[model samples]
Target chain A: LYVGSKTKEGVVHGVATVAEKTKEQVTNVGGAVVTGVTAVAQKTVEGAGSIAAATGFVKK
Target chain B: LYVGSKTKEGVVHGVATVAEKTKEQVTNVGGAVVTGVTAVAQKTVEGAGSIAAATGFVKK
Candidate 1:
């Protein structure tokens, strides 16, 4: 799942970004997105203010 | 990250199916699809013919 995104389309686009970033050739799009999201969140937390925390998880 | 489908749009629709099946309220559409695809693949492997194996992964 993708976090820090406001919409599903945004998350899909983010997943595509991560797919391009790593060039994985498996049906692990969601897995990659979750990992990438963690990195992004980490960077966000290390930012100037570090106040916005995203909490998105897969349930279904 | 959906399989057992022919097109990206098809996968998206399938993801929607899994989303309904599990009732998840996150941007884990691709994650859900991959898990659901695994189950479908398993079922197909156990089916009458067991011939088709889907291998669809997201690309840039």
Candidate 2:
């Protein structure tokens, strides 16, 4: 599952809480913070997008 | 004082308006833009940082 967010705290925390599971090392940069898990990767990405509402969604 | 800028616009406006005076110069980047005035220093950073660019605060 791929989880992503745009906040200071980091992406892992948000994903962990929402997924009800543990995740791996998170990575981010100038863009928003994102977290991804291997299971429902697509759904996880969608879910994270929903939660953070990244600009990509807006443009899309 | 020194104003830390990041956004595309500039830091001057963010601070100038709040500082209730004319700002020296605005500074920013792939981060967030800011507007600043010199009367006060630390308060300016805190207040300006609070203004939120849209990532420094959350940029697209």
Candidate 3:
């Protein structure tokens, strides 16, 4: 269970870091860009999925 | 077990995308830098842990 939690946390941390970098990239690149919107959407989906999967691990 | 595998895959995919985007970002920003190095290191560790956890699910 602890391993499961640790693995999940690692994955989340990685995603969050990616999201942060992408957001920065988007901001530096341009204004009202499609890439920025897509990046945020992907991050949101990843975040939501991570939470749901972590919850499932707890339930098991 | 299947759900576990899928979840792991999703996490890995997200990380990979972030890593790719960050690499591009680093290049666009120009000059030798530390952020790229750290991003790669983090991505590598995350990838290793992801594989280990996915393998554990397979073993189970």
Candidate 4:
């Protein structure tokens, strides 16, 4: 499975599976907004924080 | 290899691959859109938006 996110700035690195809980944390800040998932992104964007580890190694 | 994409708000779930040329075309609308030998995504978001289906079969 693929786990990472990308944004207008760039990719968030060394991360896999970004969580909604996390996205919520970030979105709490008015202007804060997160984008969608990236395909095979080796790295994620600057801030779009990483998700908690996979729930189970997600079966594609 | 599975073929699909996900989004933060929802999921680009149906789209297999989105292209820069396409994203660029969208940018022209004041909103847009990557590539890799196999498949690659840069920074696609909500208004960032869909990739065309894979040019050919993509293997993970």
Candidate 5:
């Protein structure tokens, strides 16, 4: 179970690296905002997933 | 921008640890399924986030 968790963490880390690259590639405000929003959302989902997993139900 | 992406990834990683701990505490099938679903959902969110950031729009 611990290993599975760590593996998931690693997957997130990999996605983050890609995000960094995406931001660097952006050349406009619209692009940046979009990237930022997406980044935030991604984190949000991770947060939700974590809470759900930990508590075994929807998180408040 | 690059740093921001890494930061998001780190956040996800942290949440994954909590998930691992949660799984360990569970002894029921329902709990496992719930956790598993949550984990998959978390990854899906991350996936969506990454795609959104990278493509600057909804992913197909």
Candidate 6:
């Protein structure tokens, strides 16, 4: 495991940690991506849309 | 553009937004990846190492 640095501690720690962070990060991003693509695409896209698209579970 | 929802707003909003989130996400992920791959690989890896590898930049 990696320790947070003295200069900028706690924001992150180790590889596993970063991956976890990134996962959250991009899911956020993925949410964004769908929106932009759709908006440019809809009237357009959003998390709501992605969720809907993914299922009954629901349209981007 | 995507707006946060009445249901669960702000957690995410749009597609472009998600992509952006994903970008930062993966960079963090990337940072983690290098470290883990390295650490498991040295004493072992870290963000500093990733930077170093990228540049004068330096090793894996």
**By lDDT, who's the top model here?**
1
Candidate 2, DockQ score (0 to 1): 0.03
Model 3 in CAPRI terms: which quality?
A: incorrect
Query: What does the lDDT read for residue B8 in candidate 4?
Result: 38
TM-score of each: 0.14, 0.17, 0.16, 0.15, 0.15, 0.13
The lDDT values for all models are: 0.38, 0.24, 0.25, 0.28, 0.26, 0.21
Which pairs of residues clash in candidate 5, taking residues 3 or more apart in a chain or in different chains?
none
Candidate 1 vs 2: which has more TM-score:
2
Model 1, TM vs. native: 0.14
Distance from true position, residue B44, model 2, in Å? 28
The DockQ of each candidate is 0.02, 0.03, 0.07, 0.04, 0.05, 0.04
Clashes of each: 1, 27, 0, 13, 0, 22
* Model 1 TM-score (B-chain only): 0.15
Predicted structure 5, TM vs. truth: 0.15
Tens-place lDDT per residue, model 5, B1-60, is: 322323223334323223112112323321112212221222334432332111112223
Q: Candidate 2 versus the native: TM-score?
A: 0.17
> Which model scores highest in TM-score?
2
What stretches of model 3 exceed 4 Å from their correct place?
A9-31, A36-60, B1-9, B13-60
Residue-wise C-alpha lDDT for candidate 4, range A1-60, written one tens digit per residue: 244343223333343332232211111211122234344333333434332122212222
The list of candidate 6 runs beyond 4 A from truth reads A1-60, B1-38, B41-52, B56-60
TM-score of chain B of each: 0.15, 0.20, 0.14, 0.17, 0.14, 0.13
Candidate 6 per-residue C-alpha lDDT over B7-59 given as tens digits, one digit per residue, 9 for 90 to 100? 22122122211222243343321121211112111111122221112111113
Report the poorest 10 consecutive residues by lDDT, candidate 1 chain A.
A10-19
Docking class of 2: incorrect
Error of 5 at B37 (Å): 5.7
lDDT of 1 by residue, B1-60 (tens): 266465333122132222323465446444433233332332333557543445556788
Fnat values, one per model, are 0.00, 0.02, 0.05, 0.04, 0.05, 0.04
